[PDB]
Design a protein around this ligand. Sequence first.
Ligand SMILES: *[C@@H]1O[C@H](CO)[C@@H](O)[C@H](O)[C@H]1NC(C)=O
Lengths: 40, 44, 49
Amino acid sequence: LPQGFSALEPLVDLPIGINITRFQTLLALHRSGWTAGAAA
Amino acid sequence: WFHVIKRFDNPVLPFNDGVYFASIEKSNIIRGWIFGTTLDSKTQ
Amino acid sequence: FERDISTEIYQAGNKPCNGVAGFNCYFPLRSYSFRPTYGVGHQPYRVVV
Ligand SMILES: *[C@@H]1O[C@H](CO)[C@@H](O)[C@H](O)[C@H]1NC(C)=O
């Protein structure tokens, strides 16, 4: 993570109203096993 | 810190009062997100 | 402003219910059963907020 300062502008607000306890990310696998790029 | 390269680590991370997410990436490997409590069809 | 629509069997006691009715295992939802013969307090009312 680089040094410096940056402010996050607001993007979205949704009235979903559901209870939230856990979350998980989503990856875009490419079939050319499988070969995928590098990310952090 | 999680690394994806095989390296396939997509665990169910806990949620709290808020979440800060950062991604150092090129060519758009990461796409979206899933939120919930039981992660199944029973709950919203 | 929280909406809950879970149909899981309520565990009144400590013995597990396993999704079926039993001792200390009651369904969380009951029916009002509105009838004209009922009292004014028991009469149905429509509420809009
Ligand atoms: C939200 O869901 C979690 C997981 O089922 C539960 O432990 C928690 O009590 C729920 N929140 C409320 C306010 O009931």
